[PDB]
């Protein structure tokens, strides 16, 4: 039915692949830890409507990607992931948002700010820090753990709903 093109961006090590694999796993394969960018597919019903999600798991700003610009052109919505115990990854979110704005020539791009690894007791980026950053961008903030699966489905579903809302403006 309705297809959505989703792109996961963020610094290396924050859990982009772990979040994506947790979403798309059919668990035929026990463990899967990709190291190269790839695209994954998931069919899911969101608010009664069957959605086909294509999810691009990008690499950090350091791993070269020839098709990076084209991925951002094709992408309809972006998960901007940082880790709640890595302040640099949180500061890097500005860089990733600027790249997307540079390619798409818009400040009005569907995005969700994702604070991953919320299963950890120790944390260096506070909830209000991230909620304030999300406010400054006009985008939702969601805390996730690819370990406990907390918030993982909701992060992606929230992004789909952001894309729908944008398409109806
Ligand atoms: N505690 C915790 N560790 C995580 C979580 N998500 C990912 N990791 C770990 O962080 C490391 C990097 O994860 P990875 O998925 O490769 O991150 P990527 O580079 O952003 O794709 C791996 O060792 C994972 O085990 C999480 O939600 N909680
Ligand atoms: Mg990865």
Half-sphere exposure (Cβ direction) of 31: Cα atoms closer than 13 Å = 3
Closest CA to 61 of 21, 28, 102, 33: 102
Token readout for 87 is: 């302040």
Residue 112 forms beta bridges with which residues? Answer: 79
Specify the experimental method: X-ray
| Type and span of the H or E element at 8 | strand 2-10
Contact of 79 with 55, CB cutoff 8 Å = no
CA of 59 to the centre of ligand 2 (A): 6
Range of the domain at 122: 1-169
CATH number at residue 59: 3.40.50.300
Question: What atom of ligand 1 comes closest to residue 13's alpha carbon?
Answer: 19
Token readout for 91 is: 């500061």
84 lines ligand 1 (CB under 6 A): no
Domains of the chain: total: 1
Q: What is the Cα–Cα distance from 85 to 117, expressed in whole angstroms?
A: 8
Residue 2 forms beta bridges with which residues? Answer: 51
Q: What is the Cα–Cα distance from 31 to 29, expressed in whole angstroms?
A: 6
- State the resolution, in angstroms: 1.6
Q: What is the Cα–Cα distance from 36 to 17, expressed in whole angstroms?
A: 9
CA distance readout (Å), 28 to 24, 31, 125, 135, 147: 11, 9, 35, 39, 18
CA of 163 to the centre of ligand 1 (A): 26
Strand order in the sheet with 77-83: 38-46, 49-57, 2-10, 77-83, 111-116, 141-143
Task: Give backbone dihedrals phi and psi of 43, rounded to 5 degrees, phi first.
Answer: -95, 130
């Amino acid at each position: 039915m309705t297809e959505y093109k989703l792109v996961v961006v963020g610094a290396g090590g924050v859990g982009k692949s772990a979040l994506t694999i947790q979403l798309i796993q059919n668990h035929f394969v026990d463990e899967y830890d990709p190291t190269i960018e790839d695209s994954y597919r998931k069919q899911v019903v969101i608010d009664g409507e069957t959605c086909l999600l294509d999810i691009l798991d990008t690499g950090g700003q350091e791993e070269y990607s020839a098709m990076r610009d084209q991925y951002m052109r094709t992408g309809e919505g972006f998960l901007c992931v940082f880790a709640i115990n890595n302040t640099k990854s949180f500061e890097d979110i500005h860089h990733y948002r600027e790249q997307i704005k540079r390619v798409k020539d818009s400040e009005d791009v569907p995005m969700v700010l994702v604070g991953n690894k919320c299963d950890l007791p120790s944390r260096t980026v506070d909830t209000k820090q991230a909620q304030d950053l999300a406010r400054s961008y006009g985008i939702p903030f969601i805390e996730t753990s690819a370990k406990t699966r907390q918030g993982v489905d909701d992060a992606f579903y929230t992004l789909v709903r952001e894309i729908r809302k944008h398409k109806e403006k």
